[PDB]
Amino acid sequence: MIERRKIAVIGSGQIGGNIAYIVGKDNLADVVLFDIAEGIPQGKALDITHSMVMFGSTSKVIGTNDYADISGSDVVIITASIPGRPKDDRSELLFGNARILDSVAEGVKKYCPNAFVICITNPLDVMVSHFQKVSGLPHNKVCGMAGVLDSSRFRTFIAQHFGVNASDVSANVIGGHGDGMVPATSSVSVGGVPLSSFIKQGLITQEQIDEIVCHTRIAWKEVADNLKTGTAYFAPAAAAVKMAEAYLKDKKAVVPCSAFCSNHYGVKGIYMGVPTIIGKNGVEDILELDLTPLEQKLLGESINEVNTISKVLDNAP
Amino acid sequence: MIERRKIAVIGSGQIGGNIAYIVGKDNLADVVLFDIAEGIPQGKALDITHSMVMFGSTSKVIGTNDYADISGSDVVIITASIPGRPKDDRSELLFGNARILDSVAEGVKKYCPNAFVICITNPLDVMVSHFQKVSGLPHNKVCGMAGVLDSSRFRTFIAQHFGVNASDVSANVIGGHGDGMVPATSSVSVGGVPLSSFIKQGLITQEQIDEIVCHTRIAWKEVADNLKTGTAYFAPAAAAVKMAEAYLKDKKAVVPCSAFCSNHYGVKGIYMGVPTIIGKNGVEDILELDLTPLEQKLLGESINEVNTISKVLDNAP
Amino acid sequence: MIERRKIAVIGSGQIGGNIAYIVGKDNLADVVLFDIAEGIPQGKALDITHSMVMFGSTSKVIGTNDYADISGSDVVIITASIPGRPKDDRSELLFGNARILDSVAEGVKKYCPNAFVICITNPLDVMVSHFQKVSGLPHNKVCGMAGVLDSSRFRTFIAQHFGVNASDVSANVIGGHGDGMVPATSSVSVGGVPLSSFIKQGLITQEQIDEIVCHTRIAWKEVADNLKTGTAYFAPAAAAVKMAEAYLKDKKAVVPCSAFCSNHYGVKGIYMGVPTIIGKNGVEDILELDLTPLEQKLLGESINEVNTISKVLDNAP
Amino acid sequence: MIERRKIAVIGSGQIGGNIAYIVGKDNLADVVLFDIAEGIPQGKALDITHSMVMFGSTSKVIGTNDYADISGSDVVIITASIPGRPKDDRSELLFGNARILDSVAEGVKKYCPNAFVICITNPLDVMVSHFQKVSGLPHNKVCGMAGVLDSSRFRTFIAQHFGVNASDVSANVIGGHGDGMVPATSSVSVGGVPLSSFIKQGLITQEQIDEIVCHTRIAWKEVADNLKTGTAYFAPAAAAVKMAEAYLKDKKAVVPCSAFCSNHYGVKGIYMGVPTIIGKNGVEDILELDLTPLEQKLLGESINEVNTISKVLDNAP
Numbered sequence A, B, C, D: 001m002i003e004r005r006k007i008a009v010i011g012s013g014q015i016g017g018n019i020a021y022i023v024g025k026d027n028l029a030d031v032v033l034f035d036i037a038e039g040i041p042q043g044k045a046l047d048i049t050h051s052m053v054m055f056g057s058t059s060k061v062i063g064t065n066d067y068a069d070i071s072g073s074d075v076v077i078i079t080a081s082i083p084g085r086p087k088d089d090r091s092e093l094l095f096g097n098a099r100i101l102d103s104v105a106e107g108v109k110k111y112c113p114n115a116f117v118i119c120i121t122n123p124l125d126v127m128v129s130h131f132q133k134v135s136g137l138p139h140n141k142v143c144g145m146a147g148v149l150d151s152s153r154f155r156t157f158i159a160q161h162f163g164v165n166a167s168d169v170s171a172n173v174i175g176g177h178g179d180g181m182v183p184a185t186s187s188v189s190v191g192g193v194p195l196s197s198f199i200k201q202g203l204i205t206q207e208q209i210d211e212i213v214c215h216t217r218i219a220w221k222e223v224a225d226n227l228k229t230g231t232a233y234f235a236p237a238a239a240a241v242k243m244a245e246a247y248l249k250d251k252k253a254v255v256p257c258s259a260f261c262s263n264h265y266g267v268k269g270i271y272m273g274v275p276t277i278i279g280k281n282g283v284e285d286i287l288e289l290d291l292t293p294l295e296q297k298l299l300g301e302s303i304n305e306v307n308t309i310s311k312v313l314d315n316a317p
């Protein structure tokens, strides 16, 4: 029996609404927009429903406040969060969003425990780890969207320097989705050409590369300070959809995301940004980049950053 | 010389941002997001830029507050308006938005007078007429988005009754974008089958048809009541993109929109919702539907309702 | 468990290869190209495989001569046929292609009896009926591609007259895929406007309409006489894919195709061209067009044509 | 003035027809299918025209034998060649195809001298050089399709070893389109990970890499041996479309193709397979890969192999 693909979006704010919009536009799946706030998901679902005929999609998009409606969901995308943008650090939402995810975990565990779960809620890496422990879902079926967003920014900034199509830039950001984030310059290439060659050719300087690395790391504030009323939401939505595509279409796509890293990068069992292979069984493998001694040290510092915020959460009131 | 297609979006609020997102996603054109509000268009443009590599698009999307940047725009889409949603009627925003469109008119006249202009700002039909007068652009290069949204809603509700793909429903809403809009039930077909045949076959009643007609006319309120923060914006954005597509691709597509009707539907020279043919020369034609006497009268009421609001604008302080 | 969608293409000639190409391009499913001819499916599958990375699709396309490889197929598309184009009538291939379908029926019945089967092999309507009887598959899970091709031609010719987008022309061809084919002029509309109105407006004559009807009926020879080495294959392939999409995505799409018509159009249980609704359960409903007395008579003549060729087959050597 | 994009396809055989099909499907441009063979281009154009409404495209596709019809073409793609496949080497077709391209050269020079020309006719690199000389078009507006096909094969085979999405493999083939082609294994990465790292990790051996390199170079024979009626045509068609896209959309895309290399890879002014940047001005740049000494030598052999065949053409009867 052919059953329609089904994606549950938990939290129908800025990011949640865009996800439903894009999923519906692509006819990737039916969408269930869940929110505790009255009217909002229903209003967005009705609005998006009207656009479906315009896009030529037969996707159904509905709004709900009832976890029963997410039963049979193939993918669950968690965007739920307490109000207000972070001032200086994504960790400011730690305590509130952890409690939200406790509730979301009970909903998923009861109504769709076989779903592939993509966490978006900040602070991403710690939230992903929290959700996995509380929900009890397999490690390979729970991950966090971050790397795709960070790497896309990294790739975009490199592409903007050289004036080329960003799709032809290969570039990875790894580690935690925070200031300790590691854009791995060593394995950057533009159509096969490494950055070291472009330096010799006089087309880019090491200082320009450092500026691009810094830009990647602080990119979230650049967007947030301009929007004023919140953080980025167009690209993070698109990124979550790319991850859902990889699972639903069994792409074996290489996806940088927050995944349970057990026998790679010198860590013994932690959720952090790593290049994964995603397919019909969720996170199916992790790829090991060729890191320089400096990059290994920077990754080490990112890991400490993650563990620090995680311990703070473990000692929450 | 091959040149990139360019779409200027005047007003980077709810609808404007979504237009930029979708246009970018489809790689239909480069986008210039214009707004007077500080930060907003810049923030959205940067966020949407980060998503382009995720979508595999090379569209550039920039934010600005300078009309010089809309220079050489192939299409201009106007979403600019005063804040706050309408409580009962779209006409409450009349005088404020008229002042705004004067600024846009002088901007377009100076920097891109050959552009195809699609107005979205409410009250739609009067705003379109106003923009054409002040800007001095050809009647065929200036129209308003409404019919696509209204017809899409009409098609969606018919499709939901019969349980079929809305894309296989043909249906038009004509007249002004307001309570007086005419969902032409005589124009309706589902896979070639007219509503009269469905009544005879006992697959729909006249009461159900009346309900669908009513639903269409007040659909905006159903969305707005649930959103709380404002009016519909996912579907209106998509509708504008469909109209921009018809122009940029020279589709010769049937597009219900607010266009200068000079010798059809028993009017002499007025902007109202009619089925047009849109291609590379803007509004290239208007189709004459086979309206019943009741529908002709309903359309007459709509025309007067439009003329009423238009005269009030002519008698300004 | 997410399993990839799988389409089996039985016969890897002109049409079969294009189907695999388009399915792969769209990433609609994995494709199995089956043929008894050595090398051909394998060569086409390898060639098409190389194009997948270019299209950004992860679809797997393989060639085979083994029916075991079509097990678990969601859709089976039958293109298998004896060599050579028909001279004057599609019925010339009757006896040979019936025997091929006996063999194909055994393959499907054994390895994928729950598949949605779309027959393409000519003479279409009789071949569809033959396959259903020999295979023993449910009537709603076996249909023939024809109406989509015939209607697309009908729509295209109307659209070419008016100089508009063919997607905005609603037009149906019903009955058997042969000379008795019935393009139903009565229910043609262009953006809501019926042909009767265009006649009054002086934009089309009844003689031009008759020419378009004739063109639709003899369209196959116009293509075949130009190609010389065979019959049409680009559009029939595309048409089969549209039908596969409707099933796999549960579109509830209105699809004119050869379906088992039991309580409609005055027939008591025959495969002929009718507007169907297709979804995850195959042919889920049949729509009844509003036919004129003349059109009812023409349909009657088409039905006789179908029954005549069917009786000939029943008395085969 | 908005004008439709126009692509002329010179030669409506296996590849030419597929190009028209895909270009139409994507609504990338209008297509003119040119051929001297009677009926063929007309038959394919009509067949493909019928599919346009199925794809929701408004692209026009016409067939012709008159060069006046390629007037105003933005892109010209040359597939014209003498019949019969190569047995061992692509160079067997040298003199025949050279005569053909003289006709095409004079046609393009007369009717669309500002066109971007993509040659496909074998022997590719020599034919490209020949067409440029005879036609007198700028070096940057004339290139050949080969690298995209060779690189796509290379990427596909690497991806199949690692079991990942080929789109996430970066890999280049450079030099002439023949046995001397250089799959640059030093350029290869899979999600940022180079082959050297995969060897160290025990996920691939050097022998397996050597096999992949060999597979790439003789991939054309594997397809041709299985097709029997001719050489590959699904993937070569798709490759040409990707190149046309880069030009028409001004992508600034990294495209390995046969381009006029004047001051890179240690050559003075020759057409050979190199990574280019393609945008609205044709070949806008050439990237310099970080080749090993072995790869530099292999490339040197390829350059001579190309020069050999080129000199034979210069010494015609």
Ligand SMILES: NC(=O)c1ccc[n+]([C@@H]2O[C@H](COP(=O)([O-])OP(=O)(O)OC[C@H]3O[C@@H](n4cnc5c(N)ncnc54)[C@H](O)[C@@H]3O)[C@@H](O)[C@H]2O)c1
Binding pocket: A010, A011, A012, A013, A014, A015, A016, A034, A035, A036, A037, A040, A079, A080, A081, A082, A083, A084, A093, A097, A100, A103, A119, A120, A121, A122, A124, A145, A146, A149, A177, A230, A231, A232, A233, A236
């Ligand atoms: N991982 C990343 O790269 C990344 C990028 C950007 C934003 N984010 C994060 O994503 C989250 C969402 O961002 P946003 O802009 O959509 O926020 P938002 O405030 O617009 O939306 C949050 C929504 O969650 C809902 N909600 C609150 N409590 C809930 C509960 N218990 N159950 C269900 N829903 C609940 C709210 O009603 C609201 O609609 C934030 O935590 C943000 O920091 C992450």
Ligand SMILES: NC(=O)c1ccc[n+]([C@@H]2O[C@H](COP(=O)([O-])OP(=O)(O)OC[C@H]3O[C@@H](n4cnc5c(N)ncnc54)[C@H](O)[C@@H]3O)[C@@H](O)[C@H]2O)c1
Binding pocket: B010, B011, B012, B013, B014, B015, B016, B034, B035, B036, B037, B040, B079, B080, B081, B082, B083, B084, B093, B100, B103, B120, B121, B122, B124, B145, B146, B149, B177, B230, B231, B232, B233, B236
């Ligand atoms: N035609 C339809 O069917 C339809 C449907 C929905 C909404 N609308 C209308 O579309 C308009 C926009 O809706 P929205 O939700 O995007 O509103 P919004 O408030 O989110 O956006 C309006 C934007 O216009 C900007 N603006 C204000 N003054 C300006 C000026 N002088 N120049 C340039 N920009 C200026 C604001 O900064 C704001 O960003 C409204 O008038 C609404 O009623 C029409």
Ligand SMILES: NC(=O)c1ccc[n+]([C@@H]2O[C@H](COP(=O)([O-])OP(=O)(O)OC[C@H]3O[C@@H](n4cnc5c(N)ncnc54)[C@H](O)[C@@H]3O)[C@@H](O)[C@H]2O)c1
Binding pocket: C010, C011, C012, C013, C014, C015, C016, C034, C035, C036, C037, C040, C079, C080, C081, C082, C083, C084, C093, C097, C100, C103, C119, C120, C121, C122, C124, C145, C146, C149, C177, C230, C231, C232, C233, C236
């Ligand atoms: N329904 C329609 O609208 C429509 C339109 C066009 C063509 N057609 C029909 O579709 C059929 C295929 O057309 P085509 O151009 O692809 O023909 P083709 O000759 O190019 O391909 C037929 C293929 O079937 C294979 N074949 C033969 N016997 C077989 C068997 N027992 N099992 C499996 N495969 C076998 C052959 O090897 C060949 O590759 C023809 O009957 C044609 O008349 C139908």
Ligand SMILES: NC(=O)c1ccc[n+]([C@@H]2O[C@H](COP(=O)([O-])OP(=O)(O)OC[C@H]3O[C@@H](n4cnc5c(N)ncnc54)[C@H](O)[C@@H]3O)[C@@H](O)[C@H]2O)c1
Binding pocket: D010, D011, D012, D013, D014, D015, D016, D034, D035, D036, D037, D040, D079, D080, D081, D082, D083, D084, D093, D100, D103, D120, D121, D122, D124, D145, D146, D149, D177, D230, D231, D232, D233, D236
């Ligand atoms: N670059 C690559 O990687 C690559 C890959 C595959 C094939 N090819 C080459 O592409 C070419 C075409 O392949 P195909 O399979 O389409 O061949 P084909 O024989 O199917 O098509 C060639 C067409 O050219 C036409 N033609 C002959 N003389 C002509 C003239 N003077 N003007 C215009 N048209 C003329 C023929 O009528 C025929 O339709 C071949 O040379 C082949 O070797 C190149």
